[PDB]
Design a protein around this nucleic acid. Structure first.
Ligand SMILES: O=C1O[C@H]([C@@H](O)CO)C(O)=C1O
Ligand SMILES: [Fe+2]
Length: 858
DNA sequence: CGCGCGGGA
DNA sequence: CCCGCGCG
């Protein structure tokens, strides 16, 4: 029973209830952004507003609650309606919150019962130098109660489901309400500038007679000198104003052992007057869903008003398409306050757009399911498998005779012997080409493979997986592995634990996992994970088409490619890649940053969009933007350089991994292609110089990431191993080692290194950072793709002029103003569902893996 | 090159 | 708050 709750609630009082529970037969925590973390991380009770829980129910991450009908009598009926998705109770209600009318008793002993009285009161109070009303007009959450009083709704509700095609923005009731709000602004009774902080400051300072706020504000008003009351929201045209109602709710996740135990704790250890009172003592709960305790609290007039307005209002829809509703209505109110549209114009356009975006979002969810379940172009067959197995077994004989003749196995000039683990190694730089791995210096006996990872012995199995997964490693000279998926997830967590435990660095616990990693230096390998058919981390569709594997242990499982290590023979391609890194470094095109605190120093290039730079309106880091304008030879030179670097590396990988192009084609949108680096799935490229990196999962990158290494100057490197602790392996990069791995789902790092001589190990990742490609596809939509270079040229000149006239603080004013315009442009395209990549709508990230292949052997 | 300013949130 | 940016 580990219960999550938001940090700003009463956790210590809940801990009291849980102590009183643990006795008769637990740990409450406050993780940052719980509402984003819980959606990704479920694969435990959770305390959060019901509106997210509807999305968790479409996501199946919440246990159906089965409360007794006598228990359901203990709480209010509308609270249970807030937690029932598709006719199934998704959680237990706790608290009820909604906006109320807050008023200063010394200016206003009798607050107005109707909105229509307010204009008359403002006249009088303006004569005294004060005002009738000040509330946040910037967010529709606050303005909607007035708008919807006379009719008008978000999405129509019937049969326990919201019709996303039936929006109520344009209804006559909504038109009258928005009209009354704008009339108040025109007569200077309110000013369309008024935000949360302004209105809060003006009320708590006695400068206005009323504001509109929820219970969170009560705590702040209590510190002021204001004698205030809290009452029902004014009626509009004799109608109750309808504030949205949020029910703080406790839910149980479908990935939980303790389900009937947790159900017992919630029913008769917290949802009691004793338990809710202990929490209310810690932090104020507001109104309560339990009828017994709500009658106690409502003795407080402020609490009675909160439940009053909550019952007079509408329960906030728990569907994700409410985001569309919110963006369209936010724009309608803003425009109709600033006279940028008529009330009737702004509500008509918001009705249209909100319904449009709700439609596209449901369409996008179904398109995403096809992405996740997509299959590689079928090249597997039993005949193909057999003929490929003959070719592989033959290449194994050819490779064995080549090893007898040469006296050992070799990667470039480096002696490969998997009996030894290479702890330090020497590189020679005989000439101006890349430094070459020549000698193993320090070693230990090579630790065995961990029990969850198996080397595939059969050439037939090697062929099965090669054809079905789109992997063709160097024939006769590779090792394929199979990793159980449950144990892979266990070990990923064990590795993150060790890193945390060490102080977010390489320390003893990370070193302990490393000591049991097996060396695959010099080797070319692929690790396939296998998912047993349920009868969590990864999401294979077991309804997909099934192949008959030759090995029975695959039957009833799905396979996917989590990691592959390549050894690139030095030649034309390594010359091209290394030359581009040298060109970009020499030309000052890398943006030096610190990563993971001060874990390491990385250099970045590629098609970033650093929104933090306000003048940034085109692809590239800020040096790139400048180079296109200031060059006196060719403005696109660095872009040609970046495209060739990404395409040469991509091509090298593609030859061995035929699924990579398939993945690129599957996840990059038409709108995203111009902002990828050439015809690859790479938009950002890193570069490290002799850096270790701590063990981590990359969360906001693509499905598969590429890392490559190369060397300059002679010397000796100790440490610097690349480690994949959940696959139970590590390796020293040699002449030109590349790893392609699923970084969303595979913990990885790089041990610290110590060097002798001038030797430099250059590490570089080629990855897909989806935020930059999405924002750039959005900028392209709003302004035109080919117009961004011209806009970026104008913004650089405008800022440089400002600096050279009025000082740097003028220049900063200009940059911040450009950021707001860029931001608004992006937000509009974002609201129209413009994306550069396809993303999981549930997780807000790219899928965990792709191209799952189901195997069955009847 | 250390450090303030800065954006999205 | 983080695989930026530009100023002293
Ligand atoms: O461990 C790592 O090494 C590379 C680094 O050399 C380039 O950034 C990187 O991406 C890490 O995840
Ligand atoms: Fe990484």
């Amino acid at each position: 029973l580990v219960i999550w709750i938001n940090g700003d609630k009463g956790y210590n009082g809940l801990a009291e209830v849980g102590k009183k529970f643990e006795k008769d037969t637990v740990t409450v925590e406050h993780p940052d952004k719980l509402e984003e973390k819980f959606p990704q991380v479920a694969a435990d009770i959770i305390f959060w507003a019901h509106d997210r829980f509807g999305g968790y129910a479409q996501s199946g991450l919440l246990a159906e609650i089965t409360p007794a009908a006598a228990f359901q009598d203990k709480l209010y009926p509308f609270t249970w309606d807030a937690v029932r998705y598709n006719g199934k109770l998704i959680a237990y209600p706790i608290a009820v919150e909604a906006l109320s009318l807050i008023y200063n008793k010394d200016l206003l002993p009798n607050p107005p019962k109707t909105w229509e009285e307010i204009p008359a009161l403002d006249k009088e109070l303006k004569a005294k130098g004060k005002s009738a009303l000040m509330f946040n007009l910037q967010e529709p959450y606050f303005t909607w109660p007035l708008i919807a009083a006379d009719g008008g709704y978000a999405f129509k509700y019937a049969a326990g489901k919201y019709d996303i095609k039936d929006v109520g923005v344009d209804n006559a009731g909504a038109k009258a309400g928005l009209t009354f709000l704008v009339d108040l602004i025109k007569n200077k009774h309110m000013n369309a500038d008024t935000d949360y902080s302004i209105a809060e400051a003006a009320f708590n300072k006695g400068e206005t007679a009323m504001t509109i706020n929820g219970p969170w504000a009560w705590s702040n008003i209590d510190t002021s000198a204001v004698n205030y009351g809290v009452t029902v929201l004014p009626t509009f045209k004799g109608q109750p104003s309808k504030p949205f109602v949020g029910v703080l709710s406790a839910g149980i996740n479908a990935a939980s052992p303790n389900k009937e135990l947790a159900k017992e704790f919630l029913e008769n250890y917290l949802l009691t007057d004793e338990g809710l009172e202990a929490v209310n003592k810690d932090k104020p709960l507001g109104a309560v869903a339990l009828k017994s305790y709500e009658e106690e609290l409502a003795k407080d007039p402020r609490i009675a008003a909160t439940m009053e307005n909550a019952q007079k209002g509408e329960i906030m829809p728990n569907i994700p398409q409410m985001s569309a509703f919110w963006y369209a209505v936010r724009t309608a109110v803003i425009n109709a306050a600033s006279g940028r549209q008529t009330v009737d114009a702004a509500l008509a356009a918001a009705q249209t757009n909100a319904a449009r975006a709700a439609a596209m979002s449901v369409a996008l969810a179904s398109e995403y399911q096809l992405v996740q379940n997509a299959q590689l172009p079928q090249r597997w067959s039993q005949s193909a498998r057999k003929s490929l197995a003959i070719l592989e077994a033959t290449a194994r004989k050819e490779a064995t005779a080549q090893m007898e003749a040469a006296g050992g196995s070799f990667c470039g000039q480096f002696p490969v012997d998997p009996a030894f683990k290479v702890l330090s190694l020497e590189y020679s730089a005989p000439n101006p080409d890349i430094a070459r791995a020549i000698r193993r210096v320090d070693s230990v006996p090579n630790p065995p493979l961990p029990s969850h990872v198996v080397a595939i012995q059969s050439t037939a199995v090697d062929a099965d997986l090669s054809l079905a997964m789109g992997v063709s490693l160097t024939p006769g000279r590779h090792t394929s592995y199979l990793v159980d998926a449950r144990a892979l997830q266990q070990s990923n967590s064990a590795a993150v634990a060790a890193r945390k435990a060490d102080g977010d660095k390489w320390g003893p616990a990370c070193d302990e996992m490393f000591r049991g990693c097996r060396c695959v230096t010099g080797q070319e390998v692929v690790f396939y994970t296998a998912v047993k058919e349920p009868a969590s981390l990864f999401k294979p569709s077991f309804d997909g088409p099934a192949f008959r594997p030759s090995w029975g242990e695959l039957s009833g499982k799905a396979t996917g490619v989590v990691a592959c290590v390549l050894q690139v023979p030095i030649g034309k391609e390594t010359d091209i890649i290394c030359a581009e890194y040298d060109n970009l470094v020499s030309k000052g095109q890398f943006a030096t940053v610190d990563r993971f605190g001060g874990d390491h120093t990385v250099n970045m290039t590629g098609n970033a969009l650093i929104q933090n730079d306000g003048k940034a309106i085109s692809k590239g880091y800020a040096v790139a933007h400048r180079a296109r304008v200031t060059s006196n030879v060719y403005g696109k030179a660095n872009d040609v350089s970046l495209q060739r670097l990404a395409e040469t590396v991509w091509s090298v990988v593609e030859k061995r991994l035929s699924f990579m192009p398939a993945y690129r084609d599957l996840v990059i949108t038409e709108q995203g292609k111009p902002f990828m680096l050439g015809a690859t799935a790479t938009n950002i490229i890193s570069l490290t110089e002799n850096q270790g990196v701590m063990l981590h999962l990359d969360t906001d990158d693509g499905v598969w990431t590429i890392i490559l290494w190369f060397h300059r100057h002679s010397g000796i490197i100790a440490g610097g191993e690349f480690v994949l602790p959940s696959l139970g392996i590590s390796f020293q990069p040699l002449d030109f080692t590349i790893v392609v791995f699923a970084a969303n789902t595979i913990v990885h790092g790089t041990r610290p290194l110590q060097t002798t001589g001038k030797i430099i190990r250059w590490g570089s990742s080629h990855f897909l950072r989806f935020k930059d490609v999405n924002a750039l596809a959005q900028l392209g939509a709003a302004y035109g793709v080919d117009e961004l270079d011209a806009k970026q040229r104008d913004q650089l000149e405008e800022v440089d002029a400002a600096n050279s006239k009025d000082g740097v603080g003028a220049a900063r004013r200009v940059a911040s103003c450009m950021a707001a315009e860029r931001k608004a442009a992006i937000e509009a395209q974002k609201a129209a569902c413009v994306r550069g990549v396809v993303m999981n709508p549930c997780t807000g990230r790219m899928p965990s893996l792709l191209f799952w292949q189901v195997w069955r052997k009847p």
